[PDB]
Design a protein around this ligand. Structure first.
Ligand code: 5GP
Ligand code: MG
Ligand code: MN
Length: 328
């Protein structure tokens, strides 16, 4: 709605407004547009200003991150963009700048962007069981997340991509430790442990307690990572097919190599509906419920879509089941 047309990488004022909300349609954009969105978040959150980030270095760094995401069905650059954009949305929704330092916001955002770098499209159980170079390297201890974090800092060690080059060394060490904690916290094998520790702190939560805040940041990055079903149905639904593409590719490989197959990745057992109902009911809703105790506005904006998704997937399953009552 402007007097002339601007290239797509120049975000419209309407796109900029939209970007602040969990309703943002992540499928509309090419990589160069997504890179411009991420760039805008760093400026808009005041991180360029407060960390003296060279604006060109911000752009090279993002271009380099993009390049180091693989073209997997799910664990790709558009996914990193979703996770970051949801983090950015939560900053606004939960008024996080009132609660967290700029350093904490920087850690949250940078970790979100970097959390799945160079993901191979086969999970930790595959790495461990197949005794891959990654599993050997990391001694079966969250091999992928250790890798993501190591690539993050390999990129940041290239001077033309070092967005932290103007931060003093003590600042760098703080950010580095925080980002490592957050990226390692995205390993779902630790979900129940991390939830348990957080709920423990929630018995008497304290924003001035560093251990409480680390746990909260771990919950935030976890929320954003697995947040697809918070999005409008039309945005959320295609992500499920992408995830099952990766899962089926893995379970096929495991059967072929004689390795254990998880029932939740099994072409024969799993549907879109059965995959999401349990994940929404038993992982997503309880996690967002605990967050809503600190941030009551999370209920309307994030829990409501999850309730609706749960409900719709139950309907689907009923018709999927009936369909299978015909095809045998
Ligand atoms: N069933 C299901 N699992 C999900 C969904 N979103 C994320 N996850 C799981 O949570 C994990 C989060 O780690 P990620 O690999 O995305 O960093 C994913 O590997 C995936 O297995 C979802 O919408 N449905
Ligand atoms: Mg991951
Ligand atoms: Mn992820």
């Amino acid at each position: 709605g402007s007097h002339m047309t601007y290239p797509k990488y120049l975000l419209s004022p309407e796109t900029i407004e939209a970007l602040r909300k969990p309703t943002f349609d992540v499928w509309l954009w090419e990589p160069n547009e997504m890179l411009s969105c991420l760039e805008h978040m760093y400026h808009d959150l005041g991180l360029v200003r407060d960390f003296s980030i060279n604006p060109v270095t911000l752009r090279r760094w993002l271009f380099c991150v993009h390049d180091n995401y693989r073209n997997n069905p799910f664990h790709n650059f558009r996914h990193c963009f979703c996770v970051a954009q949801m983090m950015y949305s939560m900053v606004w929704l939960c008024s996080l700048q009132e609660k967290f330092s700029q350093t904490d916001i920087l850690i949250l955002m940078t970790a979100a962007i970097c959390h799945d770098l160079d993901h191979p499209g086969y999970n930790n159980t595959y790495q461990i069981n197949a005794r891959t170079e990654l599993a050997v390297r990391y001694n079966d201890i969250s091999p992928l997340e250790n890798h993501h974090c190591a690539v993050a800092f390999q990129i940041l060690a290239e001077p033309e991509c070092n967005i932290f080059s103007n931060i003093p060394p003590d600042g760098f060490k703080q950010i580095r430790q925080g980002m490592i904690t957050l990226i390692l916290a995205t390993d779902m094998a630790r979900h129940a442990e991390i939830m348990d520790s957080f709920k423990e702190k929630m018995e008497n939560f304290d924003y001035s307690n560093e251990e409480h805040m680390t746990l909260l940041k771990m919950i935030l990055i976890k929320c954003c990572d697995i947040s697809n079903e918070v999005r409008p149905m039309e945005v959320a639904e295609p992500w499920v097919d992408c995830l099952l593409e990766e899962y089926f590719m893995q379970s096929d490989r495991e059967k072929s190599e004689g390795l254990p197959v998880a029932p939740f990745m099994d072409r024969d057992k799993v549907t879109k509906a059965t995959a999401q109902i349990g994940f929404i009911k038993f992982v997503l809703i309880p996690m967002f419920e605990t967050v809503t105790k600190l941030f009551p506005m999370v209920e309307e904006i994030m829990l409501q879509p999850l309730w609706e998704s749960r409900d719709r997937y139950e309907e689907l399953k009923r018709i999927d089941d009936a369909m299978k009552e015909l095809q045998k």
